Design a protein around this motif. Structure first.
Motif, PDB file in Angstrom:
ATOM      1  N   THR A  25     -11.409-102.782  63.706  1.00 42.99           N
ATOM      2  CA  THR A  25     -10.996-103.963  64.484  1.00 42.99           C
ATOM      3  C   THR A  25     -12.214-104.562  65.146  1.00 42.99           C
ATOM      4  O   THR A  25     -12.881-103.878  65.925  1.00 42.99           O
ATOM      5  CB  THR A  25     -10.029-103.543  65.587  1.00 42.99           C
ATOM      6  OG1 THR A  25      -8.956-102.780  65.049  1.00 42.99           O
ATOM      7  CG2 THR A  25      -9.528-104.727  66.379  1.00 42.99           C
ATOM      8  N   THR A  93      -8.108 -97.675  62.296  1.00 41.11           N
ATOM      9  CA  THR A  93      -6.997 -98.383  61.645  1.00 41.11           C
ATOM     10  C   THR A  93      -7.417 -98.808  60.240  1.00 41.11           C
ATOM     11  O   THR A  93      -8.515 -99.386  60.082  1.00 41.11           O
ATOM     12  CB  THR A  93      -6.633 -99.591  62.485  1.00 41.11           C
ATOM     13  OG1 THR A  93      -6.275 -99.078  63.784  1.00 41.11           O
ATOM     14  CG2 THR A  93      -5.467-100.354  61.896  1.00 41.11           C
ATOM     15  N   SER A  95      -5.958-100.714  56.639  1.00 41.52           N
ATOM     16  CA  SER A  95      -4.886-101.515  56.017  1.00 41.52           C
ATOM     17  C   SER A  95      -5.187-101.738  54.549  1.00 41.52           C
ATOM     18  O   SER A  95      -6.335-102.064  54.190  1.00 41.52           O
ATOM     19  CB  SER A  95      -4.733-102.823  56.729  1.00 41.52           C
ATOM     20  OG  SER A  95      -4.355-102.652  58.093  1.00 41.52           O
ATOM     21  N   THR A 100      -0.480-101.056  57.144  1.00 42.21           N
ATOM     22  CA  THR A 100      -1.447-100.560  58.135  1.00 42.21           C
ATOM     23  C   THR A 100      -1.121 -99.142  58.528  1.00 42.21           C
ATOM     24  O   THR A 100       0.052 -98.834  58.874  1.00 42.21           O
ATOM     25  CB  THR A 100      -1.453-101.471  59.371  1.00 42.21           C
ATOM     26  OG1 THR A 100      -1.815-102.780  58.965  1.00 42.21           O
ATOM     27  CG2 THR A 100      -2.403-100.965  60.420  1.00 42.21           C
ATOM     28  N   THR A 102      -2.504 -96.466  61.489  1.00 44.48           N
ATOM     29  CA  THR A 102      -3.379 -96.170  62.622  1.00 44.48           C
ATOM     30  C   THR A 102      -3.771 -94.697  62.628  1.00 44.48           C
ATOM     31  O   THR A 102      -3.027 -93.859  62.154  1.00 44.48           O
ATOM     32  CB  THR A 102      -2.727 -96.575  63.951  1.00 44.48           C
ATOM     33  OG1 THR A 102      -1.505 -95.900  64.102  1.00 44.48           O
ATOM     34  CG2 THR A 102      -2.444 -98.045  63.999  1.00 44.48           C
TER      35      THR A 102
END
Length: 330
Positions: A25, A93, A95, A100, A102
């Motif tokens: 992220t 995380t 995807s 997705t 975590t």
């Protein structure tokens, strides 16, 4: 939940397929080799020895607000081709195709072998075999599939590899538009940590089908089809001038040949591999000797239904409590 991602051949021979994966992220997109024959998700990273990186995209955990060192954890893996990698571990995380997870273990390479360095198109591997093969120590980690499974609409993923074309990996659903006829399911043994199954036999070209049990693994991370020496000799005996070359490392054939198809059994069903799928082109640039896509497993210790076989089918990896494989024509 579900996910759906396109997988693309890395070169004109379909030597491997890459699938974009978002890590961290903000997202860092890496192109990973999805490998149903291993169970580690590992990446080229900001930690990888600089001399061992040549064009790959790297994961930089320090730039991800969701990355956390998995303190004390290390990993080290060796593949059937002699290649290897090792390093440390982050959770982050991850995807795939909109699905997705975590807290996925992302294995950051500190070292990779020369075959990885030399392949600029592959930024790491995403293992899809059973989590019992994961190499993280001292706390073994789960695969992306095993972490996603409880969230998925159905506990499955499917491989639909293209011949000289892109294909698709789907998670959590079976796209009934992607195959013809019906799906034939067959039992899986997880005792060695692989998607291990038993084919019911084979045919060469238009020849009669030979009913015989062939135990092997469904392995998206292996290019070729590796079968017992008896079966492989029977195939190449149908190609004028084909021979096993100890200098080249397997069966070669004249580039002027037209190759026969190869059929394998799945229960009472049959998957036909067209002859052109078995042509891996000149052994060296400009050679008139071509490398075969069906090779002996005798020096491996296991039969491997690699991409040559799997790309001829729509393949269902059913991760229900009792795992099974499904194959359909397409």
């Amino acid at each position: 939940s579900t996910g759906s991602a396109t997988t693309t051949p890395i070169d004109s021979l379909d030597d491997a397929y890459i699938t974009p994966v978002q890590i961290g992220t903000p997202a860092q997109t890496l192109n990973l080799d999805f490998d149903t024959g291993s169970s580690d998700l590992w990446v080229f990273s900001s930690e990888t020895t600089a001399s061992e990186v040549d064009g790959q995209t790297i994961y930089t955990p320090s730039k991800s607000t969701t990355a956390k060192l998995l303190s004390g954890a290390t990993w080290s893996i060796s593949y059937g081709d002699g290649s290897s990698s090792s390093g440390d571990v982050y959770t982050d995380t991850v995807s795939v195709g909109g699905l997705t997870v975590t807290g996925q273990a992302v294995e950051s390479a500190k070292k990779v072998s020369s075959s990885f360095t030399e392949d600029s198109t592959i930024d790491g591997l995403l293992g899809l075999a059973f989590s019992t093969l994961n190499t993280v120590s001292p706390t073994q980690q789960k695969t992306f599939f095993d972490n996603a499974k409880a969230s998925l609409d159905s506990p499955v993923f499917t491989a639909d590899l293209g011949y000289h074309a892109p294909g698709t990996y789907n998670f959590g659903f079976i796209d009934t538009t992607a195959y013809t006829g019906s799906i034939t399911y067959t039992a899986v043994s997880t005792k060695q940590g692989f998607w291990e199954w038993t084919s019911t036999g084979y045919a060469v070209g238009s020849g009669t089908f030979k009913s015989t049990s062939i135990d092997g693994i469904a392995d998206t991370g292996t290019t070729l089809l590796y079968l017992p020496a008896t079966v492989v000799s029977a195939y190449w005996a149908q190609v004028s001038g084909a021979k096993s070359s100890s200098s080249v490392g397997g069966y070669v054939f004249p580039c002027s040949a037209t190759l026969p198809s190869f059929t394998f059994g799945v229960g009472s069903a049959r998957i036909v591999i067209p002859g052109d799928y078995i042509d891996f082109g000149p052994i060296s640039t400009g050679s008139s000797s071509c490398f075969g896509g069906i090779q002996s497993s005798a020096g491996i210790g296991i039969n491997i239904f690699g991409d040559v076989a799997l790309k001829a089918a729509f393949v269902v990896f059913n991760g229900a409590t009792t795992p099974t494989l499904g194959f359909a024509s397409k």
